[model samples]
Target: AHKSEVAHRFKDLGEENFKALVLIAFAQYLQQCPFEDHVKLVNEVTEFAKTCVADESAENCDKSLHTLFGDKLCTVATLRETYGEMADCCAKQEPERNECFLQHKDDNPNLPRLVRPEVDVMCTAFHDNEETFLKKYLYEIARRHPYFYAPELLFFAKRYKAAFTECCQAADKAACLLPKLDELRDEGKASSAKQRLKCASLQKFGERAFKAWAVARLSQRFPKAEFAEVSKLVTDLTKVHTECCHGDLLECADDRADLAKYICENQDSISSKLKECCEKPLLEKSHCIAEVENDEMPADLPSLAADFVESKDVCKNYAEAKDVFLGMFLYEYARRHPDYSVVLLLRLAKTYETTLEKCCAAADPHECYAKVFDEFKPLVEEPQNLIKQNCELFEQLGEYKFQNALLVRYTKKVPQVSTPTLVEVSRNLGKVGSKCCKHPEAKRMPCAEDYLSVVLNQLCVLHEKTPVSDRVTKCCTESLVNRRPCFSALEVDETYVPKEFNAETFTFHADICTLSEKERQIKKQTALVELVKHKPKATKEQLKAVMDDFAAFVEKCCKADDKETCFAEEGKKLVAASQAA
Candidate 1:
């Protein structure tokens, strides 16, 4: 039965006698074979050993018992226990270990369970603590199996060597820990001899243990900030140590003592040089003198002062010239006051025309004007027309007499006016003109030609007093003749031109009427026509149509009264219509 059981288990064991024995025992258990069969086999083997001992045979009980109990039994028990423990561990750890393995599978899928769980826990504690588990596991493995620690040591030493080499290669100011790695390597070499049992033992595990210990020590000494440099050192050392262990001694060319010396010397020299050069120089008397001579010399203030005074004189002269010019400016301003008022009226009309054009760019011009006029009649006509209607009354009552007198007084003083005082006078004059024109009675009164004349007399008086070299007099004469007709001129053509009022003739005929009804009509009508023509985006046809419609409307209003009074009443009507349009 025993032979049968052994044969059955051995049936599947191809070449391994050891495995066959274990399988036979397992097969017997599974088949529920009696335990007495196993006990009987043991007794028979013991009895055979005892008989061999009694005969003192060359193959006696001692050798047989030694083979069975020591070699075979121990090996089988160890294998069984190891496999059993492995199965138990796998069963117990599968759930949690599988999760951790999967989580970090990208880093190392085949990592041993012995190291993996500890590494995972350490890494979970802090991102920077990943090496704690690796070091711990390496140390544990080294302690448990000294022979195996050799290869692990070699791996770790290679890693440290690589790290040190990398730190050297980086040559960064902070990469100063390479010497520590060299020292560790030297200590590893020294310890290797004491740990090794024989030459063959040294070849098997001694060099590896030394390398691993050195690498671990290097890792401990690695700069915490530059992990990549440390990793590179590990890689370099691993390659070198691996080649050395494999009998390629030439591959391991590094000298720890030389490397340590170089690092120490380099650090010391650099530190000494920095200390020697870091001090700032103190300021000295010679340096101060050099600075004073080179940088603090006085500028040529005398020449600068001379230039400044010359420039000041030139500026003063120019200012005097400006005052003289202002006299001329005021003269011309008085001469053109009526025209300027007319131009302002035209500008108001133009603003209305522009508003109307925007309201109707593509509409019929007459229709557009009529629509705009109806819409804005109150805004443009009522207020301004009421002012125009009352202007004559206001002038007759002398409401603007104060303003007129002020304008006359300032014209005489414009030459003597300082820049600030000139600005003040001009501002005051503007206020007077605005107040006078805007007065309810002034709007009805005749345009103030008498006041305008007072301004003109001031100009003539200024002209009589001006010096020959006065630029003011020159500018005044030039501006008046060319830009304004302050003086009268004989008509060049007298060929019975229709007696229709003209702005040029009215200006020259300042003697005939200060503000003739006909002249006023011409001025107002001309202003209205110009306003419409110059309005932004208003075409010629649009302006003409507006003017024709305004003229026709006035003609109808006149015909409703009398033909002779048509022109008389139409002045205000035309102004109102143009403003509204």
Candidate 2:
């Protein structure tokens, strides 16, 4: 056995490496057992690992396995259909599929049918409709039991697409969707209503329906905390936009002039940086929109699409297109919008791509994709999620960072994300993070969601959220290679912020509250690296002075309750001080 190879490296017959290695080895072994048995074996290993760390015997020495990794190694109580089994019938990533499995694990004899695993369903659905996932597979997913992550993505893909199709071409352009819109007015079931409106409107309809579904399911799912801030988000975006000249976005006709007026009118609704893009001459609007999408709410997170390895061939295929970067633009747009699946946005990109070749009569098809993006800003920018009304920024940021970025970070980034790569990443992340972050007594420590948030940060280039502070990028890189998050160092500080304010501050302050001391050290060191990068020739002592200055800022503002202001001010002071010095 390979265990012998390890033994050969140690001595005549090595047990030191073997003893240390089997924890992970045994952890992997335990994962193969049935859920009930998996639980039993893991605890056995944990107990054994605890004793091994005590120096009680030479044959056992790894305490880190149980302390850091033991709990992450087991199965969920509700676990059913491992990815191998789920892959046979499901299409979404393992987490989505696993979560799907969790969704419908009950006494029903035929509860979780694997009749149409993702591969068959996706290919078949795409071929059938020649439309996006909306017309292709929306209702089927919504109606089906034993849900997977892909279904939610597909449903909204359908909703958003159908909304756009109906709004611009289908309706004469000014109506919304309700599943029961027509229902023959009296019939209980219905295909669709007779109307055309922005995809935003229909997406909101999905929101409304999903919210209803979420609320109804809440008491059963998280009965402990059933939404303290239910329906409190910017739910009515139309009203939010009333400050704009035209008031409502979905009802507005597609026009650069119209967008300009709206952006010009509602300065406060959008970020100031984006407002600048809108204010640029209309001649530069298309690029402007791309910039807006790129720059919006950036929180300085590295954009997977913007930084992705590109497919020049894919762009070249659209020879007639005006925006050569449209492919890249769509990638960023999809990532920016957390609500719809990246699968959906990429499809929408294809839909626009084809429109460019077949429909453009002009010398340049610049207007080809711009109008659609401009028109759908509300939907694209104001993405909606209805899974749980209570889950906010941290959860939202976690999903966005992981689902969109790290899920496929190392692979060849392309115009359209290949599903083959998608399935691969989700499965591995599930196993490792599940094992790495596993907790059994909390019955599941750190949880899968929390595990994802940790490693997700590992793959990303940290940002201060504003484009101005390139510091997060400068320092976080080495931190990741060192196995600590870029921001972990802030938590190591002895500094303390005042009473954490609302849910908003909780999101940013959370960076410190939950970080490991080692992680916090790496984060703080990255700050030094940034300061050094700024003052490359400064004496070590001088650089140290600024770190002290910077540390003080965190103590004063960065740690304070005004979460946004803390980071905003920190980034401003850090970057400015660095440059000025």
Candidate 3:
């Protein structure tokens, strides 16, 4: 842990004070406090923290003054002044402070950027370890199969290629090698030449290993967008190596030397290309900076965790929460992806709402919720039992409606599948499925795939937009209660419906499947039929008369200009009287 000190990387202005400053600054802006309040503290941070830090760490510090901007950085400077001095109670009210911080950070982005150490440490770790295992295996001898291998190392390296390097190095930095194959797998019945897949492998990881390995070097320098740089590099390596191995063609036994020689010949270019990419100003791909080599990060775990906590921007951070479950839920959901956003928080919050609402609606919902503590308690405790229920819910709704509702669930829990914010989250499901499911087998899981197909189908067609977000919120719990009517409320009339949601109802692939008001009445008819049984002694004939009278009255009176005058007063009384009778 860092000493609660006068001299930290941020100098005497400690986090406690910084957080307090944030609250006060925003309070002043909201007119909760007078403008001149905290005047002395604001002046001190404006001069000492902003300018002084800029002078001290000129390399990373932008010398931009907080006062020059339209709003100026007065608010942020004020918050910086309050660092280390914020009342403990205020500091602990995270959700409020976090939201406050989010708005402040966006408005005052120029307020002395701290050279965040954790970003570099995390990014660097991911970048360095990717190449080591491949080099160790590649710079080796003849193999059992066509190539050398390390299943576990290769598996992780393939997916988190750049990050794998740092992780591997962390486990045993000096060895410069990951564990061998047998340690990870049963080598005798082996599908690989050497090493093993520690994490789950993408069945084709081995086949595409070469391109993936080469890409890591370039990916560390760019965002996923400019990855064509790696694509070309992989093509070049493959084109050159294919000719080397394919022709002058000796069988696999004799071709080793030629493949090695070509790799060596091109190794210098690859290294130079890496240096070339490193020199490129990847501002759009700002995450690339974190991959750079750096001074030691917090050497101890406690220090690291402390540093990690401090690195978050308040508005956007999903890492820390005042409540312990909230904290774990955030960490568990977020650590899955590279970046976390406020939208992610919104999604989780909605899940919290929906999950609790559903649990409470159960036979003894209060009992279910009480035993579970909260909707997500099952996530950490009775997890599998939780998924079994959600699993069945999706299955009953079928692929389309379930996925349709599920999209709302996931979006409220994540974001729309169509958005870029979700692309990274898509890669990491917070391990929810794996941990909660009974069988989290390495290969494709029927249960996993079973539910995944529902979501996958929903995701592909998200561009065919509707007023989905607004309409979706009302429909999730309703989807299960009255399957057809709930979706029709989503304006299925003019909207898209996938095979997964309504194949029996309409064509799965059709651009549009129009339904009549008369046809629509069928599902409502079923609901009405169920309603009639509530009053059995009244007789079917009496109920029929009531239904016909109700229909005739609605046709006669309800109109566009005055629904209340025509329908509400009349219909409300009729509906109310008939129900009570």
Candidate 4:
């Protein structure tokens, strides 16, 4: 629609007016595309052209053109050419209108495609015939219509300035651009100057670039070298850069030019400048080089060399100082070590004294006092004397005085003894004696034999009373006598008795004894028996009754002994009587 409107407008305008309109249309189109939607909107405009070209009548042309191009009719090429001719005709009629003609030309589309190849080849050539006619055109438009061109150009210039600043600031050898920057600054190119200044002020950027450039130059001068040699040179150059940039040389006026010249010349004069910097009056330069050298030494050297030469020396010094201090402390301690050995002996003796006091404390006072005095009197007296002697010795030797004084103060007196003397002694001795006697530990007592003798004697004296008298001694003695050989031998032959005996000879001997004993008994019983026989001439039954009575009486008399003698003695008397009969 806008295209149709532009075509109708083009048809109504004269040829001179149309030419200027075409240039205006082309300029507007250029502004909208490329900078705007160049591809898509251009296609849309071409489609609008097809619609306008199909319309024949002027009214339809106007309607189609209005629909296609709208207010953009002045931007069409044909209209722009007509507008230019119209401007020329008006200038011819009114001679003072030539200035207006020139003013109208300023709004025309004559942009140059200088940098872009594709655009330059495709665009129509300018009719002005001057190499910079497009620049002149745009400049006039910007001057006349400052509202349109000034803002866009200013924005572009600012963006370019920012980019240049960033590039310079990011460069390592930014100081290499210093001379160039100063020239630009003098010519009023302050944007480039400011960027170069920012870059040069970045110490790391300049120093790092100097080191890199130095290494490369060294490599070029002496090719085919090992990495060690190259690294050493690089390290030395780095130290120089550090001293110049980070050191006080940066503050010194003279050093700055020397450093800058060394960097620019790429000469071996860096070493000389570095030495001069080191020898400068300012301490900061020397300190910085020292730090840099300290840092660089390890980085530049091989690991083994660094460990052996650097780390070993540091460790050896540390170890030597430690040993010397330790030895000094040890000697002091040994010479003036506290005299606590005497303290230990005093503590042991005190322990023994405490034990003796505790044992005595639990008993009846008098008994305990007496027993304790008797039991540990020697220990108390001797220990006190020994402690006194030790005190004198400590005083004489000028050692352990404190310990000896403590002993003299706390333990000068002896503790009294405790208990039923023998009873307590026996009880204690039994406990200690049993432990010693059973296991016989060498550690039981230092003089065990002497201690055991005292214990045994005490035990013996205590045994002769009470339970021992009736029970222990009697039972033990009876057992020993009953177990003797003579008593035991009596039962031996009984166990080994012969089964046979000479019966006839033994019966004759027995009969003789029986007859003799019967004869004696008969004489004694003769009177009684004669009296009985005369008084009673008894029958056989009666005589038999009489003999049975006599036999029972003799048996009773033999069993009942008339004399008070032991059973064994009575048995021996009866055996002799039987043998005589």
The candidate that wins on lDDT is 2
Output the worst ten-in-a-row residue range by lDDT, candidate 1. Answer: 288-297
- Provide the overall lDDT of each model, using Cα atoms, as 2-decimal numbers: 0.32, 0.33, 0.32, 0.31
Cα lDDT tens digits for candidate 4, 466-508: 2222322332233211211121122211122221222221111
Q: Which stretches of candidate 3 lie over 4 Å from their true place?
A: 1-47, 50-385, 389-430, 436-468, 472-494, 497-581
RMSD for all candidates, in order, please.
Answer: 49.2, 30.3, 25.7, 61.3
lDDT of 4: 0.31
Backbone clash count for every predicted candidate, in the order shown: 35, 17, 29, 51
CA lDDT for candidate 2: 0.33
Q: Of the pair 1 and 3, which is ahead by TM-score?
A: 3
Instruction: Put down candidate 2 lDDT per residue, 1-581, tens digits, no spaces.
Output: 22222122223212322222232222222223333343344355545544443433435342222222323333332243542443321444434433343332221122243242333343345446543343223323222311112212222333444444453343433334333222222121111110111121222233332233222222122222212311221222222222111111111112323444554565454334445556554434423542343223335545443222233233344554444344334534443443343323433454555665553445544434335444444433322221122133224444323332222222212112223233333333434332432233221222332233333332221122222223334443332222222333322111212221122221123355346553444345444333333333445456556556655655666357665677565566544644574
Q: Order the candidate numbers by TM-score, best to worst.
A: 3, 2, 1, 4
Could you estimate the TM-score for every candidate? 0.13, 0.17, 0.21, 0.13
What candidate 4 gets wrong by more than 4 Å, as runs, is 1-4, 12-54, 57-67, 70-581
